[PDB]
């Protein structure tokens, strides 16, 4: 009798508002009615789901204003919400018209409000292999994803349940990738920044980025991860780019050591195969996101990605390049410097009791328990980066900007593998400064550009802390030798270079370790004016940095 009273469109007036007497009765009291529906649940929901095509907003408000009370008083009449949910999540075939095409959007928000309630009031239970109305509600969600009618901000509370939808295999996952890609290519800007700041377009876009970060921040998936990383790679940088970095460091440390291999190897296959596209996007995976992810706290010692990269790195490294064409060349070169960056970092944050001793890493590298030193793969690495940065361009003028960055990344790999896994000063000259001049086979011509004029604004402001440094210099300069009372009483792109950091890391390790021959070589190369101005200035800034 009460359900028959409620599900009725009877018009009242305070004048011009019309305010149906189902809605107004459900506005006045709204809770003790829901205790009656608690008193007999089963006929209430079965009869409540009888008219569900006309009285759509009505019964959705009935469910919302019942689950809010069943959620808030969970401190008495316990063991209730589970049976409530596992009963109601069975008859969503009754709903077929709120979320479909030619249907109101506020009713669609109402469906997802019932969704937010059945996934807030209860736990992860109705998710596995057609447990409840999961394949009768997922299609409602998919039709609210593939529709051309929802809003750029009123999906904002509507994407947030992918944590309760990243727990699956394939089959529906393919069309999930499909609906995510189509909402991205109809709801994200094409490359970068093409919306005015302050306006409620660009701000709801950064809210969309924020809620994606909130979703994968807990829900550790490679599922959403290549989907978001493809828009993280469509340009060189983005507008909200640090937020992805903070959330990547946030997703890095959660445990789940096996899933980290999944993230690395999965976005590594999204990077790794042919996939003809532009090279910045085709390398920016391993250039930014993979390095910044596997750098911080992904896994402190991981050899499964670092077991398949044994097979999957040196095969690309030991290659030949075809220079008839650029579109076969640049892909090989970019994935080669990506592999240089990967082995750089993989030797940067690994200890020595697992990789360079006679351990299971080299037992993975070559088949059989090795008596060898562990310096076999690192010997093929060291040889080929030496070949890489000592590869001449004695007539070669094709794509020399990429080969310069390649050569410096090659030496970055070399610096990392030499600064970490041994303790003797033999290689410390022999692979770093012993550069043998047969014909053309030196270092800095081949790995430093030497091809522009560095433009300097001079000392533009703030000489504030440096005056005290100069007065302290005149303190220690006179009072140490022949100090009187006082005496006189009278009246930036060389750093951000991708080059300065590994040198000023290696020498600031090489000090605290033991005229050296490398000191003689850089002693001569700085006062020799046949040498260009460029590496003269750069090794000058080196010497200034490493005091």
């Amino acid at each position: 009798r009460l359900v028959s009273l409620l599900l009725n469109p009877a018009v009242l007036s305070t004048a011009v508002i019309h305010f149906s007497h189902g809605e107004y009765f459900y506005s006045l009291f709204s809770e003790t009615i829901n205790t009656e529906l608690l008193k007999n649940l089963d006929l209430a929901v079965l009869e409540l789901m009888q008219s569900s095509v006309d009285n759509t907003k009505m019964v959705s408000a009935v469910l919302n204003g019942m689950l809010d009370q069943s959620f808030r008083e969970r401190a008495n009449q316990k063991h209730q919400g589970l049976k409530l949910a596992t009963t109601i999540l069975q008859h969503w075939k009754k709903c077929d018209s709120w979320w479909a095409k030619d249907s109101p959007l506020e009713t669609k928000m109402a469906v997802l409000a019932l969704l937010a309630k059945i996934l807030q009031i209860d736990s992860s239970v109705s998710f596995n292999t057609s447990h409840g109305s999961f394949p009768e509600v997922f299609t409602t969600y998919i039709s609210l994803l593939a529709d051309t009618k929802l809003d750029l901000h009123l999906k904002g509370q509507a994407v947030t349940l992918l944590p309760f939808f990243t727990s699956l295999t394939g089959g529906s996952l393919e069309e999930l990738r499909r609906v995510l890609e189509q909402l991205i290519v109809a709801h994200f800007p094409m490359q970068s920044r093409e919306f005015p700041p302050g306006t409620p377009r660009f701000n709801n876009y950064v809210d969309c980025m924020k809620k994606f970060l909130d979703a994968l921040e807990l829900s550790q998936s490679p599922m959403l991860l290549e989907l978001m990383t493809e828009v993280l790679c469509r340009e060189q940088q983005h507008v909200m780019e640090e937020l992805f970095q903070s959330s990547f460091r946030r997703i890095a440390r959660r445990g789940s050591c096996v899933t980290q291999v999944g993230l690395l190897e999965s976005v590594y296959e999204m990077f790794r195969k042919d996939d003809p596209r532009l090279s910045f996007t085709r390398q920016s995976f391993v250039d930014r996101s993979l390095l910044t992810l596997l750098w911080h706290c992904s896994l402190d010692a991981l050899r499964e990605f670092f077991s398949t990269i044994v097979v999957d790195a040196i095969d690309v490294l030991k290659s030949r390049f075809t220079k008839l064409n650029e579109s076969t060349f640049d892909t090989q070169i970019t994935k080669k410097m990506g592999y240089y960056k990967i082995l750089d970092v993989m030797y940067s944050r690994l200890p020595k009791d697992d990789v360079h001793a006679k351990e299971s890493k080299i037992n993975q590298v070559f088949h059989g328990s090795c008596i060898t030193e562990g310096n076999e793969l690192t010997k093929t690495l060291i040889k080929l980066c030496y070949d890489a940065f000592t590869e001449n361009m004695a007539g070669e003028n094709q794509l020399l900007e990429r080969r310069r960055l390649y050569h410096c990344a090659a030496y970055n790999c070399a610096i990392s593998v030499i600064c970490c896994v041994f303790n003797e000063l033999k290689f410390y000259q022999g692979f770093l400064f012993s550069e043998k001049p047969e014909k053309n086979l030196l270092i800095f011509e081949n790995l430093i550009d030497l091809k522009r004029r560095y433009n300097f604004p001079v000392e533009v402001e703030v000489p504030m802390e440096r005056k005290k440094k100069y007065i302290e210099i005149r303190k220690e300069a006179r009072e140490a030798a022949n100090g009187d009372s006082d005496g006189p009483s009278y009246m930036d792109e060389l750093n951000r270079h991708e080059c300065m950091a590994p040198l000023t890391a290696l020498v600031k390790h090489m000090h605290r370790s033991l005229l050296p021959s490398w000191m003689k070589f850089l002693h001569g190369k700085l006062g020799n004016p046949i040498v260009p101005l460029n590496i003269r200035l750069f090794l000058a800034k080196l010497v200034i940095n490493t005091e």
């Binding site: 030193e373 040889k383 030496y386 000592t390 033999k426 022999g430 692979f431 043998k436």
Partner: peptide, 9 residues
């Protein structure tokens, strides 16, 4: 060139 650094290991 670097085989002088190979044989010394």
């Amino acid at each position: 060139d670097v085989d002088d650094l190979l044989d010394m290991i």
